[PDB]
Design a protein around this ligand. Structure first.
Ligand SMILES: Nc1ncnc2c1ncn2[C@@H]1O[C@H](COP(=O)(O)OP(=O)(O)OP(=O)(O)O)[C@@H](O)[C@H]1O
Ligand SMILES: Nc1ncnc2c1ncn2[C@@H]1O[C@H](COP(=O)(O)OP(=O)(O)O)[C@@H](O)[C@H]1O
Ligand SMILES: Nc1ncnc2c1ncn2[C@@H]1O[C@H](COP(=O)(O)OP(=O)(O)O)[C@@H](O)[C@H]1O
Lengths: 717, 757, 482
């Protein structure tokens, strides 16, 4: 059973026994499918549960099978799982062929109809639209170069640049107006890919390249699509420098797209060259520069599903060994996290294992002995190991290295801002990146401060959302007063530095201590001169706060008055609740967090008319297993834990609590033991999983809130 | 006995420590013989010269002597025997010629004054003192000739000879004793022992140590050879230290055959068990330090069939690749200058580069006997060896720029002409010449006929690079000898009392004010003053605890115990070091640097107290003194931006290095002192190459001007600034305009940089 | 204080804290004057001395607390617990006796003061200071008393000669303990034991601790000084059954738990009094220490008895209650009766090697071990003890020379050496000096920082035995030739 369909090598042996016991039940296989795949979360099945119609993702995007496979005809679990994989690969290939045909139809066109482009984007998945855009652009550039092959001829490459420019303008226009979130992410991926294509085309124009075999064009990633080939898996040939690989054709759902900085392209080139010479790469460097996500992006672009072995105290071996032999079997990639954090014995053992598999890979240029089993090495297999300065002695001769010394933050911010529809993106990025550089060093050091690159990306996304809210509000006001509605007409008039300052104030000021606020305001004055942001006070909320504080005997003050700081803190808490579904009111005991959120809840109930219900839960008083729920060793019955019980009661909507506002205040200390299960909740997914396998979606009204005293032991994640 | 002890100890010692052990044996013999005196004072000064503290007024600034030369000569004159030395330095005229002589140790002038003639060993040690004071770069050769004078000229005459391994394996070693071959990275000693086995007609078993099956094969081979008397071999034995201890334990209680001999080729790393090192005869193998030797090794490693392929131009490409690899590998030895850190440019980079060249020449030349030089994919090789290979380990941007300069200078269509120069002006006007041959044999012959007089100008560095390396090796000599040779309670009491007397008493904080809070320079200086005051209080309290412990009034706490242990051993305490320090800096010089830093901090605190932020602007700080100078440059940037209401991103840094008295305090200008220039001299903000090791910039002015959006001229160069001499941390980059007829690439290859200290 | 962790500020926000320090000197005066007035009601003729007695007690306790500060040694803590134990001991000694003049009362006061405030001291000058303080306070508060009779230096109290706990002369105690040692030699171990004064004081202290209930005692002193041998002697002489757990590398916590269960059921079910002998080499893990402090604090460790062991224990306790005459059915009452019998029969005596920083370590992880135990400084064999050992062991052979001439100057290391030192006396003093000079040499090596090996009285015994063998052999051969 284990050898056939090696994709369940990654799931646990106990989970293997569970899936064997649950063989005649497809409804309980969803967790395993989440585990072994990349972004696949559930298989779409009919009401009968005899044939699988298609696959879906965590976000909700789904793929439909051209020829669905019936489980009844092939009852064996491994047999129809292999059929599912093969049919998913074939369907992705065929949809990619359709999408490239479409994009070349809109390709080589003077003008682009926004309606047709939006319909095309909605028709196909994000990975497929990005891949089709890349294929079409690469083929167009290759054809234009071939026309230039005569030597000093007329330049059709300017036509390619103009087409990319008008497509980018269309995307920038489209992203500005309100869109569904999935189509929003699709647009963002498409526009960052097109920005990279535009920049590389500009470089090609500047270099006056005239030959299709010139190394200047060879260095950039080229996509070759061959619709005539019979084998669907080999249809797409991704080729860059000397190395050339086939597309993995595995579903990725929707993934964050890296901006392709010049250093990112350097990492791409180095890893690809290492893989061509049949040895892995070791992108060492300080933490926080996107090494592991660089490897993830390289794998995703190739269509290969990558493993992130987070190496900390949670790291294991027996599971590590079986998932490693599975990686060897399937051919998927595996990217280790920080390797220097292992125990010396631990590090030596994994080093010997990876040395053995790497020797097998070089021999393939074929089986290797893993757990006393000879394992055929797939040529597509690749392993990447990242340091935080070194590599063990048995691996130095076996692995290439690269310096992840510092990412190009300016280009990262410029591309991300341009993806949000911001105009003058380059100026804003060149201002904001040094601003965070100043923040990281001039501000007083604290444990909860985070001025990293992820902070930049989060702040920039929040700024984009703030701009969208402002344009929607102005559109509503224009509908009320007058009728002349034009998105661009408000767009170019609308200031944008104010929006960035508002976003950074709304996201960053709350984390500041009482002393750091003047320093932050001075930094905004220095980097963004003359421009200031004043938060629009919510007068109705202020009156409700006054009335509730009077009713609860609390003190009230505005600004410099007694209680002003507390009121501003409550207002910032309200804003974070508005823009986030997860909160942590960190502060010393005796600061007033509890009844601050209490008065905010009561004022919100008395203003908006939505009844407020709070469920105060202490995480440390009760044990983690009882907090989340017990797993029955024999019947697998679900004795829902306290938090799980509250969530299920809220979800069931027995007494209309969905219409009510629910705040799950987690008063008590926080440590990375119970919060690991809640980590899947505080992300944008907003799903909660259970050890039995049931997964629950979080209603929009529920707001997870942490009331903790200090963050000496809370992980930065 | 002396000779055999040296010839048996040095066979398993690094080449730089041979002379250290030689002088140790020389001191042993000097004490042993009765005729000559003990020379305690001379050796004590020769080992402890540098910890004698001086003053600025104690240096008379003699003409023809540098500052460090002045300190050395006055310190040497503190000895009563050399009291009249400075008078003869001023009086003598032949001193000037001898000071810059190529070999000053051969003809050391007679300067030391004495009433009676001295023994030849006394003359030798006096010349040792003079050489150390005047020309420390020859201290290694001076030591060589001193040991030759003491124990005989041919005392080291065995070390230069090749390893007579056959005699050592045959007799003088027991069959129980395993022969140990510890080789530095990038070398394998298996060849010598394999050839020895071939010439002795003795069959050996070559087993590599990679995994458990390797362990089993090694154990089976050992069990067979212990009774059959044959030899065994193990490769990279260092991989399994626990199995190494197990093998040592098994070897201890086992009687071997007379003919049995056990070999273990190893790597030099801490992980190897100490017990095997103690219980076996070790051998150290180091590659010969030469460009010609590196080329010979490279051309021997690469199979002759692979170089001679269908394109005849391949051999030229392989020769060029070998030259580049050798040039970088021999630049590695000059770590502060040749690079910024010791990278691992091992043989794997060579193999990857060879494979890349092979595949790209196969791609471009599809089985063509000849291919035109312009059709060779120069861009592909340059880009790959700049970014993927030889570039992956490169983390600093400036080393990457240096690598780009090397590749662009070497790999080009110009390289295929008969007038190609692999180096420029190696000695005087002579320069190396690229071979005109097209076959591998021609290049091998050409490298074999190399002049064998390699100077640092062969590989790009200025000729004085050898001088700095030799001086550093001499300093390492002195440190190793000093390390090689209760009362310690009294000595620590004395040194702690001296440090309390030397270190400033207290440092005043800065007075916070709303206007001062608004000013960014005041914020930076207040943070610096707080850090300095906290660390000064910590150091003063710790030393007070130490001195109280010396009198017995207090008992040694565990943290106190560690502090005293680290002090007596001379290691820098961890609790004291909160700012970036050179790795090898000892405690005494750390305390001196701290005294200077606290003095500067007191100066700025007094200046701020007297006035305010406006007076805080025109203070000529030294970047070395400040704990984080990049914070200072950022603070100046913010100050000028606030003053002129400009964005921080639209500002660029310009440098106008002028004399201290001839400086204008413009509102956008800040005074920076103590900056030192390496490998060049500035004149009217114009850079010029020179052989001087370091030029002191009188006063560097930092001016911030708006970004003009004009492309930089071809005459300006970007010079990195490093805080310390090891060049481990980067502060910022300046832009300097070089003088006429100068090549920026030549600036780049010579490792020119600005040092804060 | 060790073993305590600061509570979270969040919790402290809710529960205000009130500090209860040691009672004030006037508070102590009243709080124990009431007790003394109650206790002195037993004997009417000395009721007028109660208040000055309490005044002297509180003055001495205050001076001892102000002088022997915790910083010097970790066990220099004097709480009103010590004063309560003092008054309880005085009342216990005064209970069976019906009449006593003032001098006997002051002698019992001095005996209890020596047994409480001078017993735990480490250094000798501390003991001499404490003796001087006792003399001074007895003179100041109680002037009209015969000094020699009230506080004669050999203060030895025992109940083995008479029916009552009256003072006992050291010579009579020596003879009685010699007879008891003869019996011990005949039945139990037959190794020599020489009775220097220190042995008499130590056996009296250990017996006093054993007789009282829940008596757990802390033996600290140089290894080889006789701690376990003397403890075994007292155990047999008090009727206690000696028990020490055999330890080795295989001896894990499970084996210790089984031995704890065995000793607990022997001391709580069969009504068999047991003496638990415990050693630092016998304690291989801090789990042993935590279980021991829990046992000596609560009297019964809940972590020993579960499941089948629990059922067997209740069966045994039911049988024991049935044979005793107590009818109990539920497990709770039976468990309480078992705990009572344990705290009544279980006396654990455990020895510690002398290491001041170690006492910091052991007291750090063991709260009750330094609190609910009595600490006695066995120390090393003093010069007088060494001289007695030398005289007794070097007695068989003829170490007598009529030709000996008394030197004008004698190092007189032994203070009570006879002024005409005989050959045997002189050579015994020389052996004492050789031990002393090895001690000095070890101290000097410690001062210079070199590694030193502690010198123990077992080294003295080995030296004497080697003397015996060498002298016998050489003299035998040479007299054979003679
Ligand atoms: N605006 C206010 N005016 C007056 N009193 C206030 C105000 N806000 C809070 N308090 C008082 O201050 C205290 C705050 O209690 P609270 O439980 O909120 O503290 P906390 O810092 O969150 O504590 P913990 O860490 O235990 O959760 C209470 O006594 C409350 O009555
Ligand atoms: N090339 C890139 N483009 C865009 N964002 C990036 C890029 N590289 C890194 N990031 C961001 O920086 C962060 C890097 O996180 P992480 O992978 O933990 O760094 P490291 O690789 O040092 O472990 C991520 O949150 C990611 O969003
Ligand atoms: N007072 C004494 N007289 C004679 N021998 C003694 C005396 N005290 C101890 N010993 C000897 O010490 C040995 C064991 O000492 P021990 O009681 O184990 O020391 P400790 O218990 O202090 O570690 C016995 O063999 C005994 O002969």
């Amino acid at each position: 059973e284990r050898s056939s369909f090696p994709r369940f090598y990654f799931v646990g042996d106990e989970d293997l026994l569970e899936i064997i016991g649950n063989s005649k039940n497809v409804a309980k296989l969803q967790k395993h499918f989440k585990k072994m795949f990349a972004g696949v979360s559930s298989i779409i099945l009919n009401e009968d549960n005899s044939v699988v119609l298609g696959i879906s993702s965590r976000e909700g995007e789904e793929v439909m099978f051209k020829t669905p496979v019936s489980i009844t005809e092939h009852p064996k679990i491994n047999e129809w799982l292999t059929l599912v994989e093969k049919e998913m690969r074939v369907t992705l290939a065929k949809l990619l062929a359709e999408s490239v045909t479409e994009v070349e139809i809109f390709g080589k066109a003077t003008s682009i109809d926004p309606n047709t482009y939006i319909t095309w984007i909605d028709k196909y998945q994000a990975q497929l639209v990005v891949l089709s855009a890349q294929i079409a652009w690469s083929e167009n550039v290759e054809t234009a170069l071939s026309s230039m092959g005569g030597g000093g001829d007329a330049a059709p490459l300017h036509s390619v640049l103009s087409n990319v420019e008008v497509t980018l303008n269309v995307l920038a226009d489209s992203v500005l107006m309100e869109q569904p979130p999935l189509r929003r992410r699709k647009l963002e991926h498409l526009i960052t890919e097109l920005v990279h294509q535009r920049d590389v085309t500009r470089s090609l124009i500047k270099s006056k390249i005239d030959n299709a075999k010139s190394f200047e064009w060879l260095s950039q990633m080229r996509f070759y699509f061959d619709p005539k080939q019979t084998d669907v898996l080999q249809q797409l040939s991704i080729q860059m420098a000397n190395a050339k690989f086939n597309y993995g054709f595995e579903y990725l759902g929707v993934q964050d797209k890296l901006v392709q900085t010049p250093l990112t392209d350097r990492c791409y080139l180095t890893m690809t060259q290492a893989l061509e010479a049949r040895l892995g790469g070791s992108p060492f460097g300080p933490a926080g520069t996107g090494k592991t996500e660089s490897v993830k992006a390289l794998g995703h672009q190739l269509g290969r599903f990558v493993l992130v072995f987070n190496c900390d105290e949670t790291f294991d071996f027996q599971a590590m060994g079986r998932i490693f032999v599975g990686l060897c079997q399937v051919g998927a990639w595996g990217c280790f996290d920080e390797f220097n954090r292992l125990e010396e014995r631990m590090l030596s053992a994994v080093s010997q294992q990876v040395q053995c598999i790497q020797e097998a890979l070089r021999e393939h240029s074929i089986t290797c002995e893993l757990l006393n089993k000879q394992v055929k090495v797939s040529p597509d297999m690749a392993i990447f190991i990242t340091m935080n300065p070194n590599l063990p002695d048995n691996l130095k001769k076996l692995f290439r290295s690269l310096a992840m010394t510092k990412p190009d933050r300016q280009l990262i911010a410029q591309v991300m801002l341009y993806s949000q529809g911001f105009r003058t993106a380059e100026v804003l990025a060149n201002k904001i990146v040094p601003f965070f550089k100043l923040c990281d060093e001039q501000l007083s050091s604290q444990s909860h401060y985070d001025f990293g690159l992820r902070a930049l990306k989060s702040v920039l996304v929040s700024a984009g959302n703030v701009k969208r809210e402002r344009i929607q509000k102005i559109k509503r006001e224009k509908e009320e007063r007058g009728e002349a509605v034009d998105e661009g007409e408000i767009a170019e008039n609308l200031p944008e530095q104010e929006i960035l300052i508002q976003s950074v104030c709304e996201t960053m000021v709350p984390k500041l201590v009482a002393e750091d606020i003047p320093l932050l305001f001075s930094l905004l004055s220095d980097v963004f001169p003359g421009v200031q942001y004043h938060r629009g006070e919510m007068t109705a909320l202020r009156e409700e706060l006054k009335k509730v504080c009077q009713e609860m005997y609390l003190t009230y003050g505005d600004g410099e008055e007694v209680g002003g700081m507390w009121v501003e803190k409550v207002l910032q808490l309200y804003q974070i609740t508005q823009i986030n579904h997860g909160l942590m009111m960190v502060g010393p005991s005796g600061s007033g967090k509890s009844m601050a959120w209490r008065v905010l809840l009561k004022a919100l109930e008395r203003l908006e008319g939505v009844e407020g219900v709070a469920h105060i839960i202490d995480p440390k008083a009760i044990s983690k297993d009882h907090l989340y729920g017990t797993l029955d060793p024999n019947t697998r019955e679900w004795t829902d834990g306290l938090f799980t019980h509250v969530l299920r009661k809220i979800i069931d909507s027995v007494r209309g609590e969905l219409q009510k506002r629910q705040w799950i205040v987690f008063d008590g200390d926080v440590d990375p033991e119970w919060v690991e299960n809640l980590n899947s909740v505080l992300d944008d997914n907003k799903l909660l999983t259970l050890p039995n396998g049931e997964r629950l979606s979080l209603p929009p009204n529920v707001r997870i809130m942490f009331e903790v005293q200090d963050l000496k032991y809370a992980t930065l994640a | 006995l002396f000779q055999v002890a040296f010839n048996r100890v040095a066979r398993g010692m690094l080449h730089q420590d041979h002379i250290t052990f030689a002088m140790l044996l020389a001191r042993i013999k000097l004490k042993g013989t009765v005729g000559e005196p003990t020379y305690d004072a001379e050796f004590q000064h020769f080992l402890r010269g540098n910890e004698i503290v001086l003053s600025a007024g104690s240096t008379p600034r003699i003409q023809g002597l540098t500052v460090e030369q002045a300190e050395a000569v006055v310190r040497l004159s503190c000895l009563p025997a050399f009291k009249d030395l400075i008078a003869k330095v001023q009086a003598d005229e032949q001193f000037g010629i001898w000071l810059d002589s190529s070999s000053p140790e051969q003809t050391v002038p007679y300067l030391w004054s004495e009433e009676t003639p001295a023994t030849p060993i006394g003359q030798a040690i006096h010349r040792l003192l003079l050489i150390q004071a005047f020309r420390p770069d020859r201290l290694l050769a001076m030591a060589h000739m001193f040991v030759s004078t003491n124990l005989g000229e041919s005392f080291m005459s065995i070390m230069e000879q090749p390893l007579d391994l056959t005699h050592i394996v045959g007799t003088e070693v027991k069959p129980n004793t395993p022969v140990l071959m510890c080789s530095v990275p990038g070398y394998d000693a298996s060849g010598h022992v394999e050839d020895l086995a071939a010439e002795q007609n003795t069959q050996i078993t070559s087993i590599a140590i990679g995994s458990a099956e390797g362990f089993n094969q090694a154990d089976k081979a050992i069990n067979t050879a212990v009774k059959s008397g044959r030899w065994v071999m193990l490769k990279n034995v260092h991989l399994a230290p626990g199995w190494l201890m197990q093998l040592e334990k098994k070897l201890h209680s086992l009687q071997p055959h007379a003919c049995f001999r056990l070999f273990l080729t190893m790597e030099i790393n801490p992980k190897v068990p100490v017990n095997l090192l103690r219980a076996g005869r070790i051998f150290v193998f180091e590659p010969p330090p030469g460009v010609k030797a590196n080329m010979l090794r490279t051309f021997s490693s690469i199979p002759v069939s692979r170089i001679c392929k269908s394109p005849n131009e391949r051999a030229r490409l392989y020769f060029l690749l070998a030259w580049f690899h050798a040039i970088i590998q021999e630049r590695l030895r000059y770590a502060p200058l040749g690079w910024s850190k010791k990278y691992e440019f091992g043989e794997s980079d060579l193999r990857s580069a060879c494979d890349t060249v092979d595949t790209w020449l196969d791609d471009t030349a599809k089985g063509r006997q000849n291919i035109s030089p312009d059709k060779i994919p120069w861009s592909a090789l340059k880009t790959l060896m700049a970014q993927s290979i030889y570039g992956g380990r490169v983390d600093n941007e400036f080393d990457q720029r240096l690598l780009n300069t090397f590749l662009e200078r070497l790999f080009t269509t110009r390289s295929f002409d008969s007038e190609f120069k692999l180096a420029c002006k190696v000695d005087g006007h002579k320069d190396i010449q690229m071979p005109d041959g097209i076959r591998r044999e021609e290049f091998v012959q050409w490298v074999e006929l190399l002049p064998d007089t390699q100077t640092p100008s062969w590989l790009g560095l200025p000729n004085n690079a050898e001088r700095v390396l030799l001086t550093t090796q001499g300093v390492d000599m002195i440190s190793k000898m000093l390390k090689m040779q209760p009362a310690w309670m009294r000595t620590l009491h004395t040194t702690a009392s001296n440090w309390l007397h030397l270190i400033p008493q207290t440092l005043s904080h800065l007075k916070r004010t709303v206007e001062n809070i608004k000013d960014p320079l005041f914020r930076f200086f207040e943070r610096e003053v707080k850090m300095g005051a906290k660390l000064l209080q910590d150091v003063r309290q710790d030393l007070a605890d130490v001195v109280q412990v010396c009198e017995g009034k207090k008992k040694q706490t565990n943290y106190l115990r560690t502090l005293i242990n680290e002090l007596v051993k001379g290691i820098l305490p961890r609790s004291w070091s909160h700012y970036t320090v050179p790795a090898g800096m000892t405690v005494i010089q750390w305390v001196s640097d701290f005294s200077e830093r606290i003095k500067q901090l007191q100066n700025i605190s007094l200046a701020a107290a007297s006035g305010g932020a406006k007076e805080l602007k025109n203070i000529h700080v030294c970047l070395g003194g400040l704990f984080v100078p990049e914070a200072y440059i950022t603070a100046t940037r913010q100050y000028v931006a606030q003053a002129n209401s400009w964005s921080l991103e639209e500002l660029c840094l310009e440098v106008n290095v002028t004399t201290s008295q001839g400086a204008t305090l413009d509102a956008c200008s800040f005074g920076v002192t103590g900056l030192k220039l390496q490998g060049a001299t500035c004149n009217n903000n114009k850079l010029s190459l020179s052989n001087a090791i370091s030029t002191a910039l009188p006063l560097t002015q930092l001016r911030w001007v708006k970004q003009t959006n004009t492309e930089k001229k071809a005459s300006v160069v970007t010079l990195p600034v490093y805080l310390n001499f090891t060049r481990a941390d980067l502060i910022f980059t300046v832009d300097f305009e070089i003088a006429t007829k100068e090549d920026p690439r030549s600036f780049y290859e010579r490792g020119v940089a600005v040092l804060c200290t | 204080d060790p073993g305590r962790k600061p509570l979270s500020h969040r919790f402290l926000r809710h529960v205000p804290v009130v500090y209860v320090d040691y009672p004030g000197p006037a508070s102590l005066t009243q709080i124990y004057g009431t007790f003394n007035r109650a206790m002195l009601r037993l004997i009417p003729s000395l009721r007028t001395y109660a208040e000055p007695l309490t005044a002297a007690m509180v003055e001495f306790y205050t001076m001892s607390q102000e002088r022997f500060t915790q910083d010097t040694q970790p066990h220099y803590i004097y709480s009103p617990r010590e004063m309560t134990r003092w008054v309880r001991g005085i009342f216990e000694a005064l209970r069976p006796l019906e009449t006593l003049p003032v001098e006997g009362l002051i002698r019992i006061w001095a005996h209890e003061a020596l047994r409480l405030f001078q017993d735990r001291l480490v250094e000798d000058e501390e003991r001499r200071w404490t003796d001087e303080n006792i003399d001074t306070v007895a003179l100041k508060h109680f002037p009209n008393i015969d000094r020699e009779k009230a506080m004669s230096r050999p203060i030895l109290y025992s109940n083995w000669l008479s029916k009552d706990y009256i003072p006992v002369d050291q010579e009579e105690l020596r003879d009685y303990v010699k007879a008891r040692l003869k019996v011990f030699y005949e039945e139990e171990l037959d190794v020599p034991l020489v009775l220097f004064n220190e042995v008499l004081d130590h056996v009296l202290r250990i017996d006093r601790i054993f007789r009282q209930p829940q008596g757990h005692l802390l033996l600290i002193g140089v290894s080889g000084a006789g701690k376990t041998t003397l403890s075994r002697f007292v155990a047999w002489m008090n009727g206690l059954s000696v028990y020490q757990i055999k330890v080795h590398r295989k001896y894990t916590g499970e084996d210790f738990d089984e031995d704890l269960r065995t000793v607990l059921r022997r001391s709580g079910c069969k009504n068999e009094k047991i003496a638990f002998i415990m050693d630092e080499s016998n304690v291989l893990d801090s789990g042993f220490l935590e279980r021991m402090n829990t046992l000596l604090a609560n009297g019964e460790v809940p972590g020993l008895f579960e499941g089948d062991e629990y059922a067997t224990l209740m069966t045994q306790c039911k049988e024991g209650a049935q044979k005793e005459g107590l009818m109990l059915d539920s497990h709770e009452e039976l468990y309480k009766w078992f705990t009572s019998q344990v705290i009544r029969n279980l006396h654990v005596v455990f020895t510690m090697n002398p290491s001041s920083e170690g006492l910091k370590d052991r007291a750090a992880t063991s709260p009750a071990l330094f609190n609910r135990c009595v600490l006695n400084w066995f120390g090393d064999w003093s010069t007088e003890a060494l001289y007695q050992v030398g005289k007794e062991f070097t007695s068989k052979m003829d170490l007598e020379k009529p030709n000996y001439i008394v030197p004008d100057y004698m190092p007189v290391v032994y203070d009570k050496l006879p002024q005409p030192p005989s050959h045997r006396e002189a050579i015994v003093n020389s052996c004492v000096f050789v031990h002393q000079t090895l001690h000095q040499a070890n101290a000097r090596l410690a001062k210079r920082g070199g590694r030193t090996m502690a010198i123990t009285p077992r080294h003295y015994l080995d030296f004497i035995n080697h003397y015996a063998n060498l002298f016998h052999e050489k003299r035998s051969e040479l007299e054979e030739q003679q």
